Design a protein around this ligand. Sequence first.
Ligand SMILES: *[C@@H]1O[C@H](CO)[C@@H](O[C@@H]2O[C@H](CO)[C@@H](O[C@@H]3O[C@H](CO)[C@@H](O)[C@H](O)[C@@H]3O)[C@H](O)[C@H]2NC(C)=O)[C@H](O)[C@H]1NC(C)=O
Ligand SMILES: *[C@@H]1O[C@H](CO)[C@@H](O[C@@H]2O[C@H](CO)[C@@H](O[C@@H]3O[C@H](CO)[C@@H](O)[C@H](O)[C@@H]3O)[C@H](O)[C@H]2NC(C)=O)[C@H](O)[C@H]1NC(C)=O
Ligand SMILES: *[C@@H]1O[C@H](CO)[C@@H](O[C@@H]2O[C@H](CO)[C@@H](O[C@@H]3O[C@H](CO)[C@@H](O)[C@H](O)[C@@H]3O)[C@H](O)[C@H]2NC(C)=O)[C@H](O)[C@H]1NC(C)=O
Lengths: 80, 48, 73
Amino acid sequence: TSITSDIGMQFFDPRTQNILFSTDYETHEFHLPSGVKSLNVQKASTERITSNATSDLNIKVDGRAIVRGNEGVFIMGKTI
Amino acid sequence: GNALYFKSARNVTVNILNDQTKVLTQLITGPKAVEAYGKKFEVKTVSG
Amino acid sequence: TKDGLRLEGESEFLFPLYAKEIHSRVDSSLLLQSTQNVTVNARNSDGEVTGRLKVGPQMVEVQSQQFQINSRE
Ligand SMILES: *[C@@H]1O[C@H](CO)[C@@H](O[C@@H]2O[C@H](CO)[C@@H](O[C@@H]3O[C@H](CO)[C@@H](O)[C@H](O)[C@@H]3O)[C@H](O)[C@H]2NC(C)=O)[C@H](O)[C@H]1NC(C)=O
Ligand SMILES: *[C@@H]1O[C@H](CO)[C@@H](O[C@@H]2O[C@H](CO)[C@@H](O[C@@H]3O[C@H](CO)[C@@H](O)[C@H](O)[C@@H]3O)[C@H](O)[C@H]2NC(C)=O)[C@H](O)[C@H]1NC(C)=O
Ligand SMILES: *[C@@H]1O[C@H](CO)[C@@H](O[C@@H]2O[C@H](CO)[C@@H](O[C@@H]3O[C@H](CO)[C@@H](O)[C@H](O)[C@@H]3O)[C@H](O)[C@H]2NC(C)=O)[C@H](O)[C@H]1NC(C)=O
């Protein structure tokens, strides 16, 4: 169901006259939708990664892991 | 010099049929919702 | 013809048209174009146009209370 133009897709509910969805990204800022399972973003600025109180975080990667601490790293744990 | 229109008192159910007259992609513009059934969607720009 | 009527010419309708099913030929792809815009409209029981699929001069607009996308199922 392809579409094509210079600007792109649009949609706004006429009962609000607010653009509920657009694809001229420079104008309207994108927001995170609800109900998302995973997201694969090519660059992340994360303050903290944490799990929930049941299962284990797994920083797993087929590639190489390069963790660099500019002021230093501190590993705290029971069995390391 | 004129604008081609399409109107109805009801849904405009644009669809496509295969050789067996089975629906593959559909675009139903109804009164409340504008559904686009199919196997995909896309929005491209001119440059690709 | 016997089962229908074939026309090879520009049948300019100087007044409105009406039908129920608009098809395209099996061996040729329907095209519909203009210079300003092409509009699809749908109306409520009171004739109020409520869902529009407008292809404007630059970029498409869809106007409705909802915008789903599904699979064939
Ligand atoms: C805390 O994190 C754990 C780890 O992810 C969560 O457990 C997992 O939760 C997901 C989603 O609720 C489960 O996925 C689904 O589970 C059902 C049955 O449990 C299964 O039939 C589905 O196919 C799907 O896999 C996952 O199984 C579950 N895993 C375990 C080991 O419990 C947990 O829900 C999180 N709790 C909170 C409060 O966030
Ligand atoms: C899509 O195409 C149609 C047809 O070209 C455009 O409709 C046209 O809109 C203009 C601007 O209003 C109309 O000019 C003026 O319209 C008023 C009525 O609103 C009339 O009183 C004036 O005398 C003058 O004609 C023009 O008539 C109208 N054309 C038709 C055939 O109705 C429409 O604006 C286009 N969409 C966009 C986004 O430009
Ligand atoms: C014209 O378009 C509208 C909007 O797409 C259609 O309304 C929707 O139609 C579907 C299928 O008839 C409705 O789904 C139904 O849901 C009920 C449960 O609510 C379920 O029991 C049925 O088996 C069916 O799956 C949907 O609710 C309905 N939504 C609205 C807002 O009306 C309408 O059917 C279309 N009419 C024609 C003639 O194409």
